[PDB]
Amino acid sequence: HTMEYQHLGVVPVVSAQANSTPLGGCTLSDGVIRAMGDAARFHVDMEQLWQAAGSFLAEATGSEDACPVTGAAAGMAIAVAACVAGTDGLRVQRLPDPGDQPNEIVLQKGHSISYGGAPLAQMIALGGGRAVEVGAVNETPRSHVASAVTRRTAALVYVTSRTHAVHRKGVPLDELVAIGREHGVPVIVDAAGEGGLRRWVASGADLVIYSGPKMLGAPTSGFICGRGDLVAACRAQYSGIARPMKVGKENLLGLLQAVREYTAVPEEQRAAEQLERMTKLAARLDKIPGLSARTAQDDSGRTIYRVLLTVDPAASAATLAEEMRAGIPSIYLRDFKLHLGQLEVDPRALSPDGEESVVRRLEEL
Amino acid sequence: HTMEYQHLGVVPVVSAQANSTPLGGCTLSDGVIRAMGDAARFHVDMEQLWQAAGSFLAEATGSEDACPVTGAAAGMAIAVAACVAGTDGLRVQRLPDPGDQPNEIVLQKGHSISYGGAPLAQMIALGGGRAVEVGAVNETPRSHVASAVTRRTAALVYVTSRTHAVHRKGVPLDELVAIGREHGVPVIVDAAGEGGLRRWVASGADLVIYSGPKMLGAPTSGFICGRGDLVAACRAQYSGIARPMKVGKENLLGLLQAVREYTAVPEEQRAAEQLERMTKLAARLDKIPGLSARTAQDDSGRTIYRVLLTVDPAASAATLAEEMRAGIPSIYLRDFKLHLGQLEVDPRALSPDGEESVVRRLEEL
């Protein structure tokens, strides 16, 4: 019959570390799945579909236009290419050679992140740019950034993630927009796993990048929204460095159905339901022998709740984390606080049956 | 009479953000002050004093030898120069020109910190080296570091601070030592504000840098301890790039008296006294109108305690922080958690009269 994971010997896993790309991103709702199936039955003008999908994604973000991509990593490469090559078909097809165009891409040292091993500076190089890192991980003064903007500067890159990037004594986004407007250089925003669909565009940034499977519950996909002229320069890159970064019509329709369902549920019900589900889950874990648990808000200051595990060695935090990933139902928890002897259970990719699969696997030790 | 701060119009300040360099570092005990005064009355062979002070500082750290410096920033420059120029008097006096010596200094992207605005890579350039940053702030695989070590590599730099540097999915120190021993390249450790005087040397690193005023309660000073041959190459740099980084005999004797007093008080009494003093201080603050307080261990996982303030806007966290630094007794608190609407009160530079100066200044608002 139809091939499934069990046919390939791939047993599913339990994701208690949110929508990780190495874990397939996220699971789709029945509506997202059905949208991918209906789009796979007809031939459509992809230029007309891209223009229509862009206006849909721009309205949901309050921006001028939008351009779908495969994800946040491809979003950065295309956004940089749009600022370097523009819409000239010959310059587009000559990238990553910048030719005679300014291609310096300025960013703070603390924002030099990696996309699953691929550095953000490598995505800048694919788009014909050269990364110029300013400041240090613990400090980057505003004057350091403004002095780094010259006639050879093509764009400014800002990473919003307080999990993968560091912002301590850095330059805020509104300061970068003020710097960009002062010299006339675009500002590119990496908002890969951000839930706010309008706050980052409202900052005045020219291009804002979202990843699909992170929060919107979409298949492998993404989009770049912002100013109309630069979003138009993004689309032109699909005749160049963005040609290998294909976006199938099934992924795009599945992405639009994910946004329509995301903008329907209010953020209050999604936060309250998670806050009450993790409060009930933290009680079941705190009663385990030699394990303390409590509901804790996101340390970065977001409306996301999890269960901070206190793996006291009287009952090893590092050894116990590997024990969960090797059981019969493979379970992946957040281990960023393993140096503090702690672990976390993220509910953003955890099914109700997945919650029971974690309490049972924990009770067996 | 004798000139003091009041004669210059400099009014003292209250340090609730530990021993910050911009705040004069730290205050000295009566014994440290007396040691600086007694050393200022006699002429001594500085080579004999440096040899004697090195053996004293090496015994307290369990290393082979030690070399005093002005502080952690100068420690990095001299340690790099020791790995690049060695002990050749001509190469020492030709730095920061490396000549024909290998001068690549490999470090993780997350460890590219700054010393009060001066980047760590700039300190590497002063010592005749070239910084090679590997990986990203959120990830740096071990293979990335080992592949970056070539015949042109002079040393490996590791920053221990979990406050100013990022270690998330990075390379641990014992892995760097294994990499250094594999290729035969020294390992340089920035342990500026570390309290452990022996754990970092015991890791096998060749050179370990400590800053005086940070934890040891010393005047402006510092030292580099580690392997004998490289510590000898550090001393030779004082005929070169370390000549402007003078260390007066008063600062050095004051540093040794600080180490003798530090190794006398057990870490149990210093941690218990702080844990009980901040527990009593957190109760006086939690009773303030619209302010919650509690004793919290160091988020990085250290035996240091502070009072996490919950500045609810019902009674602005950012505005209230500036209000404390502008009062009649200027008070500086930790504002690294201001994005979370919080603030901290560090007791490492807070006198008992300084504690009362903070509760009174907080009660006046």
3-class SS string, chain A: CCCCHHHHCCCCCEEECCCCHHHCCCCCCHHHHHHHHHHCCCCCCHHHHHHHHHHHHHHHHCCCEEEEECCHHHHHHHHHHHHHCCCCHHHHHHCCCCCCCCCEEEEEHHHCCEECCEEHHHHHHHCCCEEEEECCCCCCCHHHHHHHCCCCEEEEEEECCCCCCCCCCCCCHHHHHHHHHHHCCCEEEECCCCCCCCCCHHHCCCEEEEEHHHHCCCCCCEEEEECHHHHHHHHHHHHCCCCCCCCCHHHHHHHHHHHHHHCCCCHHHHHHHHHHHHHHHHHHHHCCCCCECCEEECCCCCCCEEEEEECCCCCCHHHHHHHHCCCCCCEEEECCCCCCCEEEECCCCCCHHHHHHHHHHHHCC
Write out the two tokens for B103: 């001068």
Beta-carbon contacts of B328 under 8 Å, excluding residues fewer than 6 positions away, are: none
Nearest to A336 among B120, B165, B168 (CB): B168
CA B180/CA B174 separation, integer angstroms: 10
CA atoms of A208 and A64, how far apart (whole Å): 11
Cβ pair B122, B180 in contact under 8 A: no
Contact A163, A54 (CB under 8 A): no
Residue among B102, B285, B260, B298 nearest B183 (CA):
B102
| B130 belongs to an annotated ligand binding site | no
d(CA A307, CA A124): 37
- Largest distance between two CA atoms of chain A: 66
Pairing of strands A104-108, A130-134: parallel
Query: Helix, strand or coil for residue B8?
Result: helix
Return d(Cα A341, Cα A353) in angstroms, integer.
Answer: 27
Report how far residue A220's alpha carbon sits from residue A26's, in angstroms, rounded to the nearest whole number. Answer: 9
Could you give the angle at which helices B317-324 and B352-363 cross, rounded to 10 degrees?
Answer: 130
Q: Which two tokens stand for residue A310?
A: 């206190």
Q: Please state how this structure was obtained.
A: X-ray
d(CA B321, CA B70): 31
Cβ-contact B210, B194 below 8 angstroms: yes
Contact A344, A309 (CB under 8 A): yes
Closest CA relative to residue A296, chosen from A265, A342, A253, A238? A342
Strands (E) in chain B, as ranges, are: 14-16, 65-69, 104-108, 114-115, 118-119, 130-134, 153-159, 187-190, 207-211, 222-226, 295-297, 305-310, 331-333, 342-345
Q: Considering only CA atoms, which of B247, B186, B177 is closest in space to residue B211?
A: B247
Token pair belonging to A135: 């400041």
- Burial of residue A48, with CB atoms counted within 10 A of its CB: 0-12 exposed, 13-18 middle, 19 or more buried: exposed
CB-based burial label for B226 (10 Å; 0-12, 13-18, 19+): buried
Rg over CA atoms, chain A: 22
For residue A96, cis peptide bond before it (omega within 30 degrees of 0): yes
Burial class (CB in 10 A: 0-12, 13-18, 19+), A224: buried
Decide: helix, strand or coil at residue B124: helix
Taking CA atoms, what residue in B is nearest to A116?
Answer: B139
Q: What residue has token string 């030790």?
A: A365
Classified as helix, coil or strand, B46 is helix
Cβ contacts of B162 on chain A, cutoff 8 Å: 339
Q: Is B334 annotated as a binding residue?
A: yes
Q: Which of residues 121-140 of A touch B (CB under 8 A)?
A: 135-139
Assess contact for B250 and B39: CB atoms under 8 A. yes
Alpha-carbon span A145 to A106, nearest angstrom: 8
**Which tokens hold the place of B216?**
């040891």
Say which residue the tokens 């940070």 belong to.
Answer: B214
Q: Which residue has the tokens 């400014």?
A: A156
Q: Which whole-number Å values give the CA distances from A155 to A177, B120, B170, B280, in the listed order?
A: 11, 26, 29, 52
Per the CB < 8 A criterion, the answer to whether A216 and A258 are in contact is yes
Other beta carbons less than 10 A from residue A268's beta carbon? 9
Sign, CA dihedral A333-B169-A112-A166, equals positive
Cα–Cα distances (Å) from A278 to A73, A309, A350, in that order, read 31, 12, 11
**B252-265 as b/e: b if 16+ CB within 10 A:** bbbbbbbbebbeee
The residue to which tokens 């010959």 are assigned: A90
Q: What are phi and psi of B310, to 5 degrees?
A: -105, 85
A142 in B contact zone (CB under 8 Å): no
Select from B137, B139, B300 the Cβ nearest to the Cβ of A137: B137
Resolution (Å) of this entry: 2.4
A301–chain B Cβ distance below 8 A for any pair: yes
Chain A residues in contact with B336 (beta carbon < 8 A): 168
Residue B320 identity:
L
- Name the β-bridge partners of A292: A310
Q: How close B130 gets to chain A, by Cα (Å)?
A: 16
Distance CA B275, CA B21 (A): 25
Angle between helices A46-61 and A228-236 (to 10 degrees): 150
> What letter would DSSP give residue B23?
G
Residues paired with B99 in a beta bridge: none
CA distance A160 to A164: 9
Angstrom CA distances, A41 to A4, A35, A36, A38, stand at 21, 11, 9, 6
What are the structure tokens assigned to B342, written together?
């919080």
- Kindly provide the residue ranges of all beta strands, DSSP E only, lying in B179-272, ordered along the sequence: 187-190, 207-211, 222-226
Residues in chain B: 365
Distance of alpha carbon B255 from alpha carbon B269, whole angstroms = 22
Q: What is the DSSP letter of B309?
A: E
Residue B336: which of A168, A301, A340 has the nearest Cβ? A168
Cβ contact A36:A196 at 8 Å: no
**How many Å lie between the alpha carbon of B68 and the closest alpha carbon of chain A?**
26
Instruction: Report chain A residues whose CB lies below 8 A from the CB of B299.
Output: 340
Comparing alpha-carbon positions, the chain A residue that sits nearest to B143 is A117
Helix axes A249-262, A30-39, angle to 10 degrees: 150
A109, A133, A190: best mutation site toward chain B, by most B Cβ within 10 Å?
A: A109
A151: amino acid identity, one letter: R
Distance CA B113, CA B214 (A): 17
Residue found by looking up tokens 């922080």 in the block:
B321
Residue B295 DSSP one-character state = E
- CA dist., res. B136 & res. A73, Å (int): 14
User: A298 in contact with B at a CB cutoff of 8 Å?
Assistant: no
| Residue A163 and residue A298 in contact, taking contact as beta carbons nearer than 8 Å | no
**CA separation for the pair A148, A160 (Å, rounded):** 21
Per the listing, tokens 């050894």 go with A319
Nearest to A137 among B112, B135, B341 (CB): B112
Is the separation of the CB atoms in A50 and A68 below 8 Å? yes
Tell me the residue length of chain A. 365
Amino acid identity, residue A335? D
Cα angle B343-B346-B351, degrees, rounded to a multiple of 5: 130
Q: Estimate to the nearest angstrom the gap between the alpha carbon of B291 and the chain centroid.
A: 32
Q: How far is CA B277 from CA B68, B286, B333, in A?
A: 34, 14, 17
* Residue B163 assigned to a binding site: yes
DSSP single-letter state for residue B29? P
- A111 and chain B in contact, CB less than 8 A: yes
Please judge whether B164 and A138 are an interchain contact, meaning their C-beta atoms are less than 8 angstroms apart: yes
Residue A244 CB neighbours (<10 A): 10
| CA–CA separation, B238 and A28 (whole Å) | 65
State how far the Cα of A85 lies from the Cα of A234, in Å rounded to an integer. 10
Give the C-alpha distances (Å, rounded to integers) separating B347 from B341, B352, B360.
Answer: 20, 9, 16
Residue with tokens 């990843």: A211
User: Rounded CA gap, A15 and A132, in Å?
Assistant: 36
**Token duo for residue B219:** 């005047």
